[PDB]
Amino acid sequence: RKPKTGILMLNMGGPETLGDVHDFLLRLFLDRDLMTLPIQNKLAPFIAKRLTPKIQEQYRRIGGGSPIKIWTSKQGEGMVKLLDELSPNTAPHKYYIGFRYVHPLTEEAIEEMERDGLERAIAFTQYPQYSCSTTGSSLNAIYRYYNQKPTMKWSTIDRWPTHHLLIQCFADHILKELDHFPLEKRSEVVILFSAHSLPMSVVNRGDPYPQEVSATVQKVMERLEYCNPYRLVWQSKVGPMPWLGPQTDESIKGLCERGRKNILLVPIAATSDHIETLYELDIEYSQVLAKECGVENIRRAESLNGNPLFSKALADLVHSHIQSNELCSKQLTLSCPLCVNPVCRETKSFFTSQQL
Amino acid sequence: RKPKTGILMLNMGGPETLGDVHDFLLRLFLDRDLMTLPIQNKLAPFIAKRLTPKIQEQYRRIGGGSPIKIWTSKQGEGMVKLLDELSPNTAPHKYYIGFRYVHPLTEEAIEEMERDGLERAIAFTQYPQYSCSTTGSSLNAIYRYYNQPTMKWSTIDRWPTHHLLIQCFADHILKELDHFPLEKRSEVVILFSAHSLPMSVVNRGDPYPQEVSATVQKVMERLEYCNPYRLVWQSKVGPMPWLGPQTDESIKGLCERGRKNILLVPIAATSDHIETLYELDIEYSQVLAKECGVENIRRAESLNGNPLFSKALADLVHSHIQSNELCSKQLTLSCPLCVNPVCRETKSFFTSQQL
Numbered sequence: 129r130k131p132k133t134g135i136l137m138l139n140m141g142g143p144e145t146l147g148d149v150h151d152f153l154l155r156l157f158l159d160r161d162l163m164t165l166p167i168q169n170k171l172a173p174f175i176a177k178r179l180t181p182k183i184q185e186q187y188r189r190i191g192g193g194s195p196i197k198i199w200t201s202k203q204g205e206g207m208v209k210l211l212d213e214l215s216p217n218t219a220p221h222k223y224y225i226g227f228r229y230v231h232p233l234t235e236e237a238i239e240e241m242e243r244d245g246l247e248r249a250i251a252f253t254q255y256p257q258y259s260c261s262t263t264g265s266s267l268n269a270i271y272r273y274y275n276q277k278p279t280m281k282w283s284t285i286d287r288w289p290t291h292h293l294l295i296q297c298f299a300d301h302i303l304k305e306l307d308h309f310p311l312e313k314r315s316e317v318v319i320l321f322s323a324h325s326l327p328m329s330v331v332n333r334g335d336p337y338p339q340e341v342s343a344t345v346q347k348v349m350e351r352l353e354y355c356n357p358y359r360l361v362w363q364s365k366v367g368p369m370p371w372l373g374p375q376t377d378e379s380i381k382g383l384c385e386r387g388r389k390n391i392l393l394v395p396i397a398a399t400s401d402h403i404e405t406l407y408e409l410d411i412e413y414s415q416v417l418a419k420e421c422g423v424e425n426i427r428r429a430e431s432l433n434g435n436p437l438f439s440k441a442l443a444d445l446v447h448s449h450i451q452s453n454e455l456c457s458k459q460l461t462l463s464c465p466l467c468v469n470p471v472c473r474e475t476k477s478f479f480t481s482q483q484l
Numbered sequence: 485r486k487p488k489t490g491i492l493m494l495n496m497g498g499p500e501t502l503g504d505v506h507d508f509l510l511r512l513f514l515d516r517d518l519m520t521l522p523i524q525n526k527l528a529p530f531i532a533k534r535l536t537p538k539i540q541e542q543y544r545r546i547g548g549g550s551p552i553k554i555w556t557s558k559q560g561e562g563m564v565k566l567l568d569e570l571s572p573n574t575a576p577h578k579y580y581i582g583f584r585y586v587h588p589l590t591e592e593a594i595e596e597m598e599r600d601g602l603e604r605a606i607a608f609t610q611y612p613q614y615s616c617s618t619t620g621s622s623l624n625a626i627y628r629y630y631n632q633p634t635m636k637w638s639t640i641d642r643w644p645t646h647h648l649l650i651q652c653f654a655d656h657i658l659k660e661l662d663h664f665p666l667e668k669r670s671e672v673v674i675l676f677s678a679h680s681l682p683m684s685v686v687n688r689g690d691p692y693p694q695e696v697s698a699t700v701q702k703v704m705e706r707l708e709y710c711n712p713y714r715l716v717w718q719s720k721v722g723p724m725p726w727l728g729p730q731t732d733e734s735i736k737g738l739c740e741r742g743r744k745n746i747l748l749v750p751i752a753a754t755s756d757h758i759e760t761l762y763e764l765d766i767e768y769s770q771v772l773a774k775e776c777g778v779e780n781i782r783r784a785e786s787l788n789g790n791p792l793f794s795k796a797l798a799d800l801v802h803s804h805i806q807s808n809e810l811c812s813k814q815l816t817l818s819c820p821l822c823v824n825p826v827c828r829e830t831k832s833f834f835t836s837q838q839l
């Protein structure tokens with residue numbers, strides 16, 4: 129009857145409609161895990177207002193908002209159905225969405241999980257590769273909510289950059305897209321793995337993300353038996369500060385100018401369609417930039433989205449995590465060597481200290 | 485029987501003695517693949533004489549020179565013994581050392597190989613993870629030698645995740661973890677340390693950080709995530725931006741946050757050299773660490789004479805022989821933002837080989 133085990137699927141989220149953009153921006157400018165601003169309570173509303181039209185326009189260019197919730201729901205639905213057969217002692221399982229900056233907010237889902245009187249809660253990040261500004265920020269909200277005692281037992285699947293069925297899904301979607309290039313151009317295709325960039329100040333303090341993203345790439349390339357040559361590059365840089373690159377836009381253009389005009393783009397750090405793929409790569413870079421460069425064929429591997437094999441990966445991850453009795457990865461128990469955020473430490477002990 | 489198959493083992497090198505330091509710096513400062521300077525031919529000799537005392541001093545702190553040649557030779561000898569047995573149809577195998585900036589120079593080795601009348605030459609880099617500034621520079625020199633062959637050439641240009649490479653590192657990590665007090669073992673944090681790159685190199689498209697990241701992952705899987713870790717970067721010089729957390733700052737930041745038990749792992753080199761014996765062992769493990777409040781800092785032993793490592797070497801060459809590959813798929817892609825006209829010529833040198 130009643131749900132026994134909740135799986136909290138964590139993601140940043142993105143505005144479902146144009147009307148949701150302002151509040152999405154506002155919550156995010158108010159997050160000190162993400163940025164510290166002078167007179168932040170004053171500037172955040174002000175910044176959210178000045179950015180709103182530009183960002184609304186981007187979502188307009190993709191049909192009016194983000195498909196993130198729909199994909200997350202469908203993936204969660206499939207995960208639960210599998211998990212009830214695979215793990216009948218922890219069943220009935222139930223998935224909750226906890227988005228960081230849009231509705232169902234992390235705090236709302238945790239509230240609902242508590243109401244449902246679950247025996248067990250699992251914090252399951254949907255970022256395979258761990259960043260403190262991504263998964264860490266999501267785990268920080270969970271600790272903060274209880275600080276602002278659980279009545280359920282908590283653990284986290286805080287990273288999974290090389291899960292073997294994640295890797296197969298990526299390899300499968302790549303091979304699928306390679307087949308859409310003209311046959312004569314197939315061997316000539318260069319693969320650009322593309323992940324949201326980070327500011328160097330984040331990279332330089334110890335963030336796990338670039339090294340983990342690199343690991344996902346190697347695994348996909350082994351599985352593909354190095355059929356095409358590749359580079360891992362980074363997108364979504366903003367402002368004048370240095371970020372990790374090489375930049376995805378610059379690389380497409382760089383490569384084109386060097387005679388490599390057939391390019392396959394691979395969103396390697398996300399599991400669903402969102403602004404980064406549908407607007408940034410598909411419109412901003414594939415349509416505009418690439419036309420101006422004389423590109424012959426640019427394409428983008430399909431996001432994992434509703435791949436039934438990705439649901440199987442999710443369930444396998446949850447099932448394995450339940451059998452292992454782990455509370456968090458070994459990696460979580462180590463903070464960035466130059467972490468200056470007092471909460472990271474509290475969030476880690478929140479998980480390592482759980483009864484059970 | 486005359487040698488049939490030569491394996492050219494490519495490394496930057498390092499000065500064997502104190503007297504070798506000046507010419508080591510001079511060749512580095514003359515190399516435009518590495519560095520473009522105003523009035524370079526005037527300044528290179530001048531920078532080389534200015535840096536010589538300080539760099540000699542570092543080698544004097546480690547006994548008077550680099551052991552690179554000795555380890556490269558032992559590794560070479562072991563590889564060749566295995567290869568004559570493993571692959572008789574390509575036998576007599578012979579190894580050559582081609583250092584980029586010290587004797588046997590790349591150009592001297594190639595001249596000896598040609599003179600020995602070998603049927604084939606394999607350019608075998610000793611950097612598992614490819615950088616255009618390490619392996620790439622080595623392959624550029626081979627191309628440029630002939631531009632300034634009587635054997636069929638090919639390259640083993642990268643091998644960042646060879647299964648027996650990975651085992652050697654895992655083996656050496658585990659043996660080093662045994663040397664901590666038992667009660668401190670689970671608390672040990674592992675810092676994987678690789679020579680850094682300027683951001684201008686990284687941002688250009690350099691393949692090295694992602695390959696170095698791949699090696700770290702494989703070793704950590706083999707170790708079943710027994711300890712927590714970070715990949716950090718050493719050997720930054722000058723005021724420009726360079727990649728990734730610095731190794732020295734990470735040791736210090738970690739001590740300050742209660743993580744005082746640290747295993748350092750040289751993940752991007754296969755032998756002892758200035759980076760391990762001086763920078764890690766003396767500059768950080770002795771001086772900085774005293775200054776910090778460290779309880780235990782250790783460094784995993786370099787692969788050096790591990791007989792499993794010469795087995796990796798032989799296995800790599802044997803599979804390369806059986807596969808008939810001229811170079812990796814990766815080498816056929818130059819950096820998206822490469823502004824060096826040779827890289828493309830060096831690639832075609834290899835992709836275009838007869839055979």
Ligand SMILES: C[C@H](CCC(=O)O)[C@H]1CC[C@H]2[C@@H]3[C@H](O)C[C@@H]4C[C@H](O)CC[C@]4(C)[C@H]3C[C@H](O)[C@]12C
Pocket residue numbers: 156162163183261326327330364366
């Ligand atoms: C770089 C930063 C990661 C936080 C950090 O590591 O410092 C990320 C996390 C969420 C990102 C923001 C969100 O995607 C929302 C905005 C999206 C726009 O496309 C750019 C600005 C925008 C405001 C982003 C800027 C920046 O890239 C943010 C803030």
Ligand SMILES: C[C@H](CCC(=O)O)[C@H]1CC[C@H]2[C@@H]3[C@H](O)C[C@@H]4C[C@H](O)CC[C@]4(C)[C@H]3C[C@H](O)[C@]12C
Pocket residue numbers: 164165166171175
């Ligand atoms: C200095 C500070 C960043 C803090 C830091 O990284 O150290 C920056 C980041 C965003 C900036 C603000 C935003 O760019 C929005 C405004 C833009 C105007 O051009 C200047 C004032 C303005 C109100 C900025 C003032 C200030 O320079 C802010 C608040």
Ligand SMILES: C[C@H](CCC(=O)O)[C@H]1CC[C@H]2[C@@H]3[C@H](O)C[C@@H]4C[C@H](O)CC[C@]4(C)[C@H]3C[C@H](O)[C@]12C
Pocket residue numbers: 162163164175178179327329366367368369
């Ligand atoms: C793009 C926007 C400013 C636009 C405006 O003037 O309204 C600014 C406001 C706050 C900025 C962020 C904050 O200054 C905090 C971060 C500071 C880092 O040095 C760069 C990324 C970083 C995450 C910034 C990226 C970008 O420059 C942001 C997102």
Ligand SMILES: C[C@H](CCC(=O)O)[C@H]1CC[C@H]2[C@@H]3[C@H](O)C[C@@H]4C[C@H](O)CC[C@]4(C)[C@H]3C[C@H](O)[C@]12C
Pocket residue numbers: 512517518519539617680681682685719721
């Ligand atoms: C990585 C960088 C080359 C720049 C590049 O990536 O192109 C390397 C290659 C060889 C290096 C140099 C050589 O190791 C010799 C010198 C050694 C000293 O310890 C530092 C300065 C010194 C002069 C080095 C500085 C720098 O890190 C160099 C120049």
Ligand SMILES: C[C@H](CCC(=O)O)[C@H]1CC[C@H]2[C@@H]3[C@H](O)C[C@@H]4C[C@H](O)CC[C@]4(C)[C@H]3C[C@H](O)[C@]12C
Pocket residue numbers: 520521522527531
């Ligand atoms: C201009 C060049 C950096 C090249 C670049 O921009 O990429 C730098 C690097 C090392 C410098 C030189 C060396 O450091 C040695 C000299 C040091 C003196 O303090 C200035 C002159 C001096 C002769 C330098 C002139 C110039 O600033 C050089 C040649």
Ligand SMILES: C[C@H](CCC(=O)O)[C@H]1CC[C@H]2[C@@H]3[C@H](O)C[C@@H]4C[C@H](O)CC[C@]4(C)[C@H]3C[C@H](O)[C@]12C
Pocket residue numbers: 518519520531534535682684721722723724
């Ligand atoms: C440290 C030494 C300057 C010593 C001196 O003042 O005499 C200089 C000489 C040439 C320099 C290098 C060259 O300028 C080329 C490289 C340029 C990058 O911007 C930084 C690293 C880079 C590899 C430099 C590192 C370092 O500052 C070097 C190696």
Ligand code: FES
Pocket residue numbers: 260264334335462463464467468469472473
């Ligand atoms: S910023 Fe990474 S642990 Fe605090």
Ligand code: FES
Pocket residue numbers: 616620689690817818819822823824827828
């Ligand atoms: S610099 Fe990498 S290929 Fe030229």
